[PDB]
């Protein structure tokens, strides 16, 4: 019946470049439907044969966020995005 979709976990593949350069600038904030809330140093995105999802760098340690499909994401002056722009 549909073949073309556009479900993305968080960041897409345009809209991540834009968003986590513009709207992260490497520093982003996470937080989830427990109130849960946490800046994160440095970060890139990584997109799945099947899906997408964000890994940043912890300063000495590489980090998965976003491939959970993590409730929302605020960065200071920008703004918050839950699971995808939708």
Do not use: W
């Amino acid at each position: 019946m549909s073949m073309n979709d556009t479900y993305q976990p968080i960041n897409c593949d345009d809209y991540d470049n834009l968003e986590l350069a513009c709207q992260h600038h490497l520093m982003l904030t996470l937080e989830l439907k427990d109130g849960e809330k946490l800046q994160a140093k440095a970060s890139d995105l990584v997109s799945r044969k099947n899906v997408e999802y964000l890994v940043v760098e912890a300063a000495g340690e590489t980090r998965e966020l976003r491939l959970d499909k993590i409730t929302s994401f605020s960065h200071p002056e920008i703004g918050t995005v839950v699971v995808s722009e939708s």
